[PDB]
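Title: Request for sanity check on metal-binding protein yoda prediction

Description:
We are preparing a figure and want to confirm that the structure record we downloaded matches what your pipeline produces today. Could someone re-run it with the sequence below and paste the raw structure tokens into this thread? We only need the token string, no images.
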Amino acid sequence: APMTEVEQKAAAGVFDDANVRDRALTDWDGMWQSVYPYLVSGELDPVFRQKAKKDPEKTFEDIKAYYRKGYVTNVETIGIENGVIEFHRDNNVASCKYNYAGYKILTYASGKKGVRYLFECKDANSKAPKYVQFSDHIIAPRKSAHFHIFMGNTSQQALLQEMENWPTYYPYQLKANEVVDEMLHH
């Protein structure tokens, strides 16, 4: 089902902490493609033009740069199923079964808020990131349409400080025109 008014607002970074609930990894089940190659090929340009158009203080170039830095990753593909996350990084592959480590409510410099969902790989000698945090503009159980994922090997606390890079994933099947469509409307 589509989004309630509380869900739309939470998605814009406006919510009561009392409404935030735990989510399960199954909210992100599925096969997913990085949006980064579409920024690279220039196919996300219409997204950045609309953002520039709607705010006279912004420029296309600086909006795109911000997204470039945000989206950049070589993990082109992520698969999620049965508690396992698979990471395809160029010709390298890696997977691990992930345990839930709770959620964190963040307030950003902008004054907007968001929730990250923290997972841990406890198989300490895997090539899969040890720490993973999902952020997808949702604050309570609901299947993701797309997500940002923070990946790190040092600590969860350290990853919570990451604000610049946020590799971003949409359903594997979607074409670039469909990714654009979702960005411009949802």
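Thanks, this matches our download. The two ends are 14 Å apart (CA to CA).
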